[PDB]
Every structure is written in structure tokens, then in C-alpha cells.
Amino acid sequence: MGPGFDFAQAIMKKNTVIARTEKGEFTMLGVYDRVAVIPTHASVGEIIYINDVETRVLDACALRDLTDTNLEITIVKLDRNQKFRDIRHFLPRCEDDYNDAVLSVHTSKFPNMYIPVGQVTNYGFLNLGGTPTHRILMYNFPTRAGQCGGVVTTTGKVIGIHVGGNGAQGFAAMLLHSYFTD
Ligand SMILES: c1cn2cnnc2cn1
Numbered sequence: 001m002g003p004g005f006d007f008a009q010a011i012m013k014k015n016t017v018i019a020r021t022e023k024g025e026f027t028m029l030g031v032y033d034r035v036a037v038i039p040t041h042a043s044v045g046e047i048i049y050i051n052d053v054e055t056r057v058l059d060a061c062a063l064r065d066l067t068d069t070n071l072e073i074t075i076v077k078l079d080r081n082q083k084f085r086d087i088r089h090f091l092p093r094c095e096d097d098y099n100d101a102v103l104s105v106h107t108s109k110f111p112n113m114y115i116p117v118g119q120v121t122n123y124g125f126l127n128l129g130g131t132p133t134h135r136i137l138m139y140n141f142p143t144r145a146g147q148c149g150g151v152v153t154t155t156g157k158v159i160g161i162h163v164g165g166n167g168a169q170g171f172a173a174m175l176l177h178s179y180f181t182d
Pocket of ligand 1: 142143144145146147148163164165166167170
């Protein structure tokens with residue numbers, strides 16, 4: 001509808017796949033080469049479905065900060081025959097607050113879904129499903145089940161992936177450039 005939705009659509013149309021695990025269907029962001037991210041609660045194993053194709057997982061790493069606290073981001077390397085557009089230059093370098101973000105989701109249940117979530121707070125600590133979690137972004141939108149893995153963008157930046165909500169607020173795990181150095 002406007003330039004925020006423009007940037008979000010550009011990311012969805014080239015840098016997402018539908019990931020299925022035994023814990024459900026997730027929006028999955030591809031970052032570069034065969035490397036993607038998904039919420040750690042997706043419980044990625046040795047095999048995953050990518051757009052309904054059986055795919056070997058070459059590596060999966062559940063990130064934690066240097067205090068050994070959950071970040072809720074798993075970095076997955078897929079045995080896929082095709083690379084993702086490199087979007088690492090759209091990742092923030094530092095923890096920050098943002099204005100006027102969009103949450104985008106693409107699953108079988110919620111295809112081509114875009115949500116203007118508004119102002120994003122560097123919330124920090126969250127007890128997420130009973131798990132102490134750091135680097136949490138918060139937005140004041142009543143998100144629901146089906147949206148986990150959804151991409152949080154501003155114009156020109158890919159800032160997080162949706163990992164939970166409390167019925168009134170939604171929560172994303174930050175993406176930082178430093179997670180994807182090679
Ligand atoms: C339950 C589950 N959720 C996932 N994302 N937001 C929510 C809210 N309530």
C-alpha cells in the first residue's frame with residue numbers, strides 16, 4: 001500500500017520459503033547462499049520440508065548470547081540446489097528501536113499476509129514460553145499462532161523474526177549482521 005509494504009514484499013517474494021517441521025509450518029527467511037533462519041521452538045532436525053520438498057539439514061545452530069541466554073534464532077544450512085539472494089547488507093549492526101515496521105508471513109494458512117505493526121521497542125529480556133530470552137523486539141499488535149517466523153522489516157532493514165505474543169503484544173528475535181559473517 002506504501003513504501004514499507006514495498007520493501008516487505010521485495011523480501012517476501014525472493015527471500016522466503018515455507019518450512020515444515022514436526023512442530024508445524026513456519027515462514028523461513030533465507031539470508032544468503034543456502035543459509036536461513038527459523039525460531040528455535042520449530043525444533044529443526046536432520047530433515048525438514050522446504051516448499052513441501054524433503055530437504056537434508058547440513059547444519060543447525062540454536063544461537064545463545066555470551067551470557068548463555070536463549071536468543072530464539074536457529075541458523076539452518078539447507079541441502080538445497082539453489083542459493084538465496086544475499087540480503088545481509090539489510091541487517092542492522094546494533095540493537096535498536098524502530099518506527100513503522102511491517103510483519104510479513106507466508107504459509108499455507110496465511111499466504112501473502114502483511115501487518116503494519118507500528119513502533120518497535122528494544123524490549124530486551126522476555127520470559128518466552130518459560131525460557132529466559134534476550135534481544136527481544138516488541139510491537140503492540142495482537143499476533144496469533146501461524147505468524148512465527150514472520151519477517152519484521154522497516155524501509156531498508158530486515159530487523160527480526162516473529163517468535164511469540166501475549167494476545168495484545170507481539171515479540172520478535174533481533175537479526176544482527178554479526179550472526180551471518182563467513
Ligand atoms: C499465542 C501465540 N502467538 C504467536 N504469536 N503471537 C501469539 C499470541 N498468542
